[PDB]
Amino acid sequence: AQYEDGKQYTTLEKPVAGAPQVLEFFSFFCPHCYQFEEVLHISDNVKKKLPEGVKMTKYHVNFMGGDLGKDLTQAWAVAMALGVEDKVTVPLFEGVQKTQTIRSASDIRDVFINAGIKGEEYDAAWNSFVVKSLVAQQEKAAADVQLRGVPAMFVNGKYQLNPQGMDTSNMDVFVQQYADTVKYLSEK
């Protein structure tokens, strides 16, 4: 077959019921995740190849970066709660991996302030039970599948993308193969 279990994707040994159509995991510490967001724009290109209105979810993970990794999962919950993902993703990636200016929770907060989120609303969100629940949801989703590495993408709670089997000679062809694989898995 052109798409084979074990090549462009693998199938979950313990399938996950009741999952979003497309579920992505990342870490702001994760070098391929930086590539996936800032260079390849995987999430946008997958969205463009899926039907309008398809639910796409993206969650942060705790297993990289120790204490700061957990702070970033909570900040990502803040970003989801306030709907400012598109305003903080690039400065968080660059602050962690490029300039290495994000070293504490306060440095994370500065990124939101610079993006125009008012301090009182960032702080209220950070301490809210709505955000506590979003943090639990991110941890539970990672526990549902078995997650030891990022980036990771799951389709219909059944299929896991395998980017190691796609072409890396050309970045645009890689993205096209990734997105077309997601589309194929979504129509399964």
Side-chain angles (χ1 to χ4, degrees), residues 1-6 8-13 15-37 39-47 49-51 53-102 104-119 121-145 147-188:
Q2 300 278 357
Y3 295 103
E4 308 218 270
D5 201 308
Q8 301 95 322
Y9 70 101
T10 52
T11 309
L12 280 175
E13 292 313 300
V16 155
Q21 296 147 294
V22 174
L23 177 61
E24 283 181 274
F25 294 94
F26 78 105
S27 169
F28 284 108
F29 281 97
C30 153
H32 272 123
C33 303
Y34 190 108
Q35 291 303 306
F36 269 32
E37 154 68 26
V39 176
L40 304 183
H41 312 266
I42 289 288
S43 300
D44 311 342
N45 276 287
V46 165
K47 187 159 176 240
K49 283 270 176 75
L50 289 179
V54 59
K55 181 75 221 105
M56 271 177 87
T57 308
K58 179 138 69 180
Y59 287 159
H60 198 260
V61 301
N62 292 339
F63 61 82
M64 306 194 62
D67 202 73
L68 201 36
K70 265 199 106 182
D71 275 327
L72 288 159
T73 297
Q74 186 164 346
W76 188 244
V78 170
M80 298 201 284
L82 303 175
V84 294
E85 299 99 317
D86 290 344
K87 296 177 181 175
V88 296
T89 298
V90 169
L92 288 165
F93 264 120
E94 299 198 345
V96 175
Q97 292 189 44
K98 177 172 193 193
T99 60
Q100 297 188 351
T101 50
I102 296 180
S104 69
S106 170
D107 298 333
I108 298 169
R109 179 175 183 283
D110 288 345
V111 166
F112 284 74
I113 301 296
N114 187 232
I117 294 89
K118 297 167 200 281
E121 63 168 332
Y122 181 87
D123 294 340
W126 182 269
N127 291 293
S128 66
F129 289 84
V130 158
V131 152
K132 291 212 207 318
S133 172
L134 281 164
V135 169
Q137 289 170 52
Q138 293 179 90
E139 301 189 14
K140 171 175 190 317
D144 278 351
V145 306
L147 200 82
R148 205 202 329 175
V150 279
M153 178 172 302
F154 297 87
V155 179
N156 294 334
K158 316 190 263 283
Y159 307 111
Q160 178 175 359
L161 274 287
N162 181 30
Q164 287 95 332
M166 319 170 165
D167 165 72
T168 59
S169 76
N170 180 306
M171 314 192 98
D172 298 313
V173 171
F174 173 84
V175 171
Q176 183 177 75
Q177 289 183 358
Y178 199 102
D180 288 348
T181 303
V182 175
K183 184 175 193 279
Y184 158 80
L185 295 170
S186 85
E187 300 158 354
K188 262 175 100 77

